[PDB]
Subunit: 155 residues, 4 copies
């Protein structure tokens, strides 16, 4: 119910035109997206977490310095695909919500790609298995992720 | 060459009593230890890194917010073995030097244990292989590290 | 869809009494469980994989020597809780199917615990988050898994 | 002491021309290299391990089926760079010795590349940091390793 309802909310975000009101490339913009997707579903919708979380051997940015990290991440440049991917990779490492980081930050990435490069990711053609592998590796080396995503951009 | 002299430098730190002048439980204190062990050996002795580093697939705190991270980590409480281990785990994730984090931060840990618990680690009885495993796991769960060290304390 | 239907099959395995005919602690027994759960749902139901697979940075036993590995794994002893967990850990590393290893092998584990200790895991009280973490760690050290499961055995 | 003495033996393996007498692409050939490097230094020189080992959170092939694994791995083809790297990656996962797998298996790799492609790796121009990263990743995805090594091939 939660994930189907948030998918409907994501659809609403685009169909409504409310997507055009989201700040691009900023922490606030990511919060806007998360609040939109999960509002009325998670009580923490749009809110930066205060608890620590991990997945698959990686511990995401410690909540005690997550806000400081986000301030630095949102200032990263967006001039090229490689810069945009690097910025996305650091926002994923920040992982600022208890849940729904993936969906919200992928929308956030698409807005950055669209603003700067006039392209978005064609997610329907991206393997979820290969995407997860590439994201898991990305804090160490974003090569796999860049190869995967660059092949799946659409203008 | 470097490791041999730095081991001599660590013995001098203790045997001279210079160890008693090290600030306990702080970033500055860790820098003091690192400067003492590696002064004249690494030109970055005592200095917070500006480059990014990883080991075993784990990305240590990004250099862009590392200084900010350290300000927070050093304020962590030190009242119990579990608190002190948690603080140590976070200082390891920070990994604030290019090299020599292990040796420096273990001395740092012992000073915190000594101050607050009147105990230090009996490293003589700790397997390096098992210690490395526990440290690698610690960001996700410090159970292995607590299991390894707690009954290896000595007063 | 597949998950809801396989769950129904797993309930039927127990409710029908068919569970009592499953060979305990063997590769063939694991295959019997997988075929029952996934027959008609995955065309590879019950079948040892010929493709390589990975999760979270760990590559499961190479398909080229998987059958050989399974021959050794099923011979492992089941004399104590700790031996049984060790055997379960090796069967998870083998990871013999393309999908459904988790559900099938947890049933397989319970049959081994029941046969040798007259216990099963009370999975209802086991955190999925902590279980996944413990499984991810288990190839290196099964301490987390033993801590988790021993606290959740039932008669 | 052992690392320096083994380097000298490695030096001699090439200086003497004995490298030309080593069996190429086989388990026996790898054991020959390991014995040349470490015979008289490690008591287990040239011997397939009977103990389990791991590094960086990765469990190498279980000793109970390591021999069976090696029988399969040595049969892997060697016709393309990609096949040769895949074979090397599997021999590293097998990790057949207690110690000295890296040095011995890199020599083994060069012999297979030399035989089949008339090239070897120019290890002088390969970053040890990037190499270890690429090795750690290789069981999941050998792209990093292939990217790192292919443009460092020489004759
Ligand atoms: N080990 C890891 N290291 C770094 N990033 C990871 C790791 N595991 C998962 N990720 C990323 O974290 C995301 C999942 O975060 P989560 O907060 O569960 O988002 P979600 O929207 O609920 N699920 P999803 O749609 O699967 O992304 C994945 O899509 C990956 O981008
Ligand atoms: N994958 C990992 N994840 C988290 N921590 C790690 C990892 N690998 C190593 N460590 C920790 O990092 C330390 C090594 O950092 P490093 O900067 O190499 O210190 P060192 O003093 O040069 N070597 P050592 O004496 O082996 O600790 C180890 O002792 C562990 O505490
Ligand atoms: N990185 C890892 N290393 C070792 N084991 C893992 C890892 N990730 C997951 N596992 C185990 O693999 C199982 C999942 O295997 P899979 O074939 O997807 O089974 P499933 O029944 O489809 N899913 P689940 O019900 O979630 O177990 C998990 O339940 C864990 O036991
Ligand atoms: N986490 C890992 N996963 C896969 N392979 C690894 C991992 N860590 C290290 N390796 C590989 O194992 C080798 C080290 O094996 P080891 O038996 O220590 O050999 P060594 O010759 O003693 N050391 P080195 O000269 O550094 O390779 C490295 O060179 C890597 O190829
Ligand atoms: Mg999620
Ligand atoms: Mg070091
Ligand atoms: Mg699954
Ligand atoms: Mg070694």
């Amino acid at each position: 119910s939660i994930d189907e309802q948030s998918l409907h909310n994501a659809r609403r975000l685009f169909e409504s035109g409310d997507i055009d009101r989201i700040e691009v490339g900023t922490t606030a913009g990511l919060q806007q997206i998360h609040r939109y997707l999960f509002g009325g579903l998670y009580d923490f919708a749009g809110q930066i977490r205060e608890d620590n979380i991990s997945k698959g051997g990686f511990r995401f940015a410690n909540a005690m310095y997550l806000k400081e990290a986000l301030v630095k991440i949102e200032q990263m440049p967006e001039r090229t695909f490689e810069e945009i991917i690097a910025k996305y990779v650091e926002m994923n490492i920040a992982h600022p919500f208890l849940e729904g980081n993936g969906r919200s930050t992928r929308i956030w990435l698409d807005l950055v790609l669209k603003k700067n490069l006039k392209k978005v990711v064609n997610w329907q053609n991206v393997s979820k298995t290969l995407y997860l592998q590439a994201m898991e590796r990305s804090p160490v080396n974003d090569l796999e992720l860049r190869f995967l995503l660059k092949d799946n951009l659409t203008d």
